[PDB]
Every structure is written in C-alpha cells, then in structure tokens.
C-alpha cells in the first residue's frame, strides 16, 4: 500500500526469483515516483530476467538523463549483447562511467563474440585470479573454449 511496503514486496519477490511479481510491484512504485532510479534499475533487471531485452533496453534509452552516472551501462550492454548488437555492447562497456566486475565479465563475453581471443584470454585469466564467487570452474571452461577457438586457426 505505502511505497516502503511496496519495496518490501519488490525485495521479497526478487530474493525468491519471482521477477514477474517483482515487475508488477516495481511498476506500481513507478506510477507513484516516475523517475525513481532504483525502481527503473529493478524494472530493467526484471525484464532481462524474463527475457524481455528490447523492453529493458527501451526503459534505459527513454530515461537517459535520469540515469546519468547510474547509466545502467552493464544492463544496457547486456541487452545489446543479447540482441546480437555486439559492437553497440562493446561501445557501451567502453564508455561506462565506472568499471565493475560484472562489466568485465560481460566484456570477456563480448570479446569472445568479436573473436578478439587474445584480449579475451587476458580478461578471463584476470577474472579467475581475482574472483570471489562459485563460478571459477565455469570461467575455466570459458578459458578453454577461447583457446579451442584459437586452435582452429593454427
């Protein structure tokens, strides 16, 4: 009912992976506070989680001024990447106000798609060295896939 109570529901649904219900709730918050940056960010996340990449990208691109330096560069680049706009995704990553681990993760994937395998390997070696998650075996698999792609050429 109240905005903080709506946020409580956003958090509960998101934590449980119910992005559909979180999105419905976030949209109610946006009806009350139309340019709430956190709500716009959550909406974009819900849309990506439900495979609505065009809609997510549209949210970002129609709120450019409001999202300045919370530009959602990771999410924007992610959507472009999933929409096979790889050059756009690269540009978005490179022009991001603040670099982050998630941006670097996506950057590795973008370089792989661009067949820039040497720089890709450097990015993945770095990610494996400095990781703080449970995805290192998956990253090592990515590393091996990159080397396999290179081997095709020699």
């Amino acid at each position: 009912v109240s905005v903080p109570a709506l946020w409580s529901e956003v958090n509960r649904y998101g934590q449980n992976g119910d992005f559909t219900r979180a999105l419905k709730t976030v949209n109610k918050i946006l009806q009350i506070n139309k340019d709430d940056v956190t709500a716009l960010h959550c909406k974009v996340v819900c849309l990506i989680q439900n495979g609505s990449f065009k809609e997510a990208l549209n949210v970002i691109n129609t709120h450019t001024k409001v999202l300045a330096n919370n530009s959602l560069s990771f999410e924007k680049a992610y959507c472009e990447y999933r929409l096979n706009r790889i050059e756009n995704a690269l540009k978005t990553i490179e022009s991001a106000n603040q670099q982050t681990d998630k941006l670097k993760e996506l950057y590795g994937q973008v370089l792989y798609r661009l067949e820039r395998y040497d720089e890709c390997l450097a990015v993945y070696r770095d990610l494996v060295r400095n990781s703080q998650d449970d995805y290192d075996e998956e990253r090592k698999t990515n590393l091996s896939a990159v080397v396999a792609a290179q081997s095709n050429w020699e």
Partner: peptide, 23 residues
Amino acid sequence: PLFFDLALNHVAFPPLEDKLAAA
C-alpha cells in the same frame, strides 16, 4: 567446448535497504 553466459548471473537488483527504510 562449452561457453557460459556468466554475465547473466550478475543481473540483480541494486541494494534496497535505503528504499525499504524510506531514506
């Protein structure tokens, strides 16, 4: 042989405690 989209795993809400608190 496999290549994983690990970036998808990082698609997550920002911290919400300020919004929960009505800060």
